[PDB]
């Protein structure tokens, strides 16, 4: 039911050939989208029959550079706009048409009736109608501060006007079913949302987007959190305090706040806190901890020095690992952040006077065993056939994913194979390996055993054909169980067919 979103924006997919597949994996069977629902750079043919289940988007809905005419987001009731496109808009619809004409024609957001924070930006798309027919301030929440709306009607077609059955001639479509239902501006008592004109028809104070009845069970969407079908303001805390002394005792009614729903325990690859929350980055003056059975938590901390990757501390704005900053990972056995290798890395920049990065400097990462964020590689030294410097890397969490989708990204590399012999799991997100001319031993890795949730998979294309690998004799050594291996020889096997010999198999 609940699924991660994305964070690409106007940035253009490197593998258009698999781009749609990623979205299907992300949004198939998904009712609530944690983070942003980004739909970008789709063709006319494209079937989006997976988006039909989507109901909430805690992020910001972006529909940009799409030659499709239909985007079925009928069931979408609420956009919380926790994050905003350009920090100002909760819904952005940009450049959908131009070089049967192509482009978005109807928005058909017939169930959207709530935008808690953030405005609406619609511009640059000719086929679109029913963009100025909608009363946006009824969908905008009462306390919503960001109530900005910049819309562009500039078109190249005629708009068949709303059904006469659409009160106020306010509609998403010509159809009788696409009439905009109001649930704020037409209420009395002043109560934010209602299902009728009288105050006795007001929705409970803890509902959002409307309701079917007075009580808090009846809400179309909960404004704050969902307490097993009820909408509470906070979830029940895990701690109760002795009336007299204030001795913290755990109460059995306690629930962690994941997204906008109270949960007994967090989902996988998510951190439980003493503050009664599920999160991906731990609060300040806090350290990450592992449990008896691997369960990662978050204890308060004197707090130990630790290795920050990209998207953390000073490496928040840093684009990728470079010669100027490669030295920091010295001895790091775990980087708290993302590792992103770019052409500019090994090429260097003379305008900053950051020299090139030599292939021996990558030796540093021999120590490194876990990455909280993600590993992205669109560059490498052609010197190296494989990823040996990351032979030690046991797990990529992907708590921060690249473009919000991909844990592991390998594109445009002159390398023979991988060799991540230690890589036993990928915590969250999808694997994007493409346009790697020489890459073999790809179908040899059992990626079905590196993934943890079904929204995950590997997306490969423009590699070296396995037909060629087998033909040039590049396959798994006979001492690698079920021929699962990361590269050539017994120095790569996953499970050894017979007993160890340290590095090598025998």
């Amino acid at each position: 039911q609940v699924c991660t979103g994305t964070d690409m924006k106007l940035r253009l997919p490197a593998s258009p050939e698999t781009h749609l597949d990623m979205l299907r994996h992300l949004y198939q069977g998904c009712q609530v989208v944690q983070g942003n629902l980004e739909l970008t750079y789709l063709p006319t043919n494209a079937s989006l029959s997976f988006l039909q289940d989507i109901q909430e988007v805690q992020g910001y809905v972006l529909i940009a550079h799409n030659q499709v005419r239909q985007v079925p987001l009928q069931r979408l009731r609420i956009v919380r706009g926790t994050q905003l496109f350009e920090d100002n808009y909760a819904l952005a619809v940009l450049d959908n048409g131009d070089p049967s004409p192509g482009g978005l024609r109807e928005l058909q957001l017939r169930s959207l009736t709530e935008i808690l924070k953030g405005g609406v930006l619609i511009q640059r798309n000719p086929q679109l109608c029913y963009q100025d027919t909608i009363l946006w301030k009824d969908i905008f929440h009462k306390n919503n501060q960001l109530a900005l709306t910049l819309i562009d009607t500039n078109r190249s077609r005629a708009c068949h006007p709303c059904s006469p059955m659409c009160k106020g001639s306010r509609c998403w479509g010509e159809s009788s079913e696409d009439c905009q239902s109001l649930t704020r501006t037409v209420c009395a008592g002043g109560c934010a949302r209602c299902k009728g004109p009288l105050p006795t028809d007001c929705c409970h104070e803890q509902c959002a987007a409307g309701c079917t009845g007075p009580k808090h069970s009846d809400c179309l969407a909960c404004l704050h959190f969902n307490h097993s079908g009820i909408c509470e303001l906070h979830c029940p805390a895990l701690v109760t305090y002795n009336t007299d002394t204030f001795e913290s005792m755990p109460n059995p009614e306690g629930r962690y706040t994941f997204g906008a729903s109270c949960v007994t325990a967090c989902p996988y690859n998510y951190l439980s806190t003493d503050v009664g929350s599920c999160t991906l980055v731990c609060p300040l003056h806090n350290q990450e901890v592992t449990a008896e059975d691997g369960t990662q938590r978050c204890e308060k901390c004197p707090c130990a020095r630790v290795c920050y990757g990209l998207g953390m501390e000073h490496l928040r704005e840093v684009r990728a690992v470079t010669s100027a900053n490669i030295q920091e990972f010295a001895g790091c056995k775990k980087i708290f952040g993302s590792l992103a290798f770019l052409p500019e890395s090994f090429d260097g920049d003379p305008a900053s006077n950051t020299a090139p990065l030599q292939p021996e400097q990558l030796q540093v990462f021999e120590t490194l065993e876990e990455i909280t964020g993600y590993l992205y590689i669109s560059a490498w030294p052609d010197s190296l056939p494989d990823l040996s410097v990351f032979q030690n890397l046991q797990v990529i969490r992907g708590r921060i994913l690249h473009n919000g989708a991909y844990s592991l990204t390998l594109q445009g590399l002159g390398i023979s194979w991988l060799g991540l012999r230690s890589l036993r799991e990928l915590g969250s997100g999808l694997a994007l390996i493409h346009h790697n001319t020489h890459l073999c031993f790809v179908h040899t890795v059992p990626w079905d055993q590196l993934f943890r949730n079904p929204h995950q998979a590997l997306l490969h294309t423009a590699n070296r054909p396995e037909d060629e690998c087998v033909g040039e004799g590049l396959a798994c050594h006979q001492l690698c169980a079920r021929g699962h291996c990361w590269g050539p020889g017994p120095t790569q096997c996953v499970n050894c067919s017979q007993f160890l010999r340290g590095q090598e198999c025998v």
Partner: nanobody
Amino acid sequence: QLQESGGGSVQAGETLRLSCTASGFTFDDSDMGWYRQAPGNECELVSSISSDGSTYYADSVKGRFTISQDNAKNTVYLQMNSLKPEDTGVYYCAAEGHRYELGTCAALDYWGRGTQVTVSS
């Protein structure tokens, strides 16, 4: 649940009685009021009565329209005498207390409230 009754086609100069019926409530300490919206013209407050029976009207209706809140049957009446075609439109009753946001006429139009008035000559 408030409903409007008493509309119809009539020749001008005739009379109509309008009923603002309820399904629960008490209008006590909550002065009621009739509104009306003519085709492609602004929503107007035609008449309103206090909790104590101190009536108000607009300049076009006074001496022709008399408003009155029955306590027993718990229904608000609006007697419209000396009807003119300039009157024609849809008349919505609604507590001046429980006032909407998108506009009284506009909101009650959404929920399908009020009753239709038609006047020829």
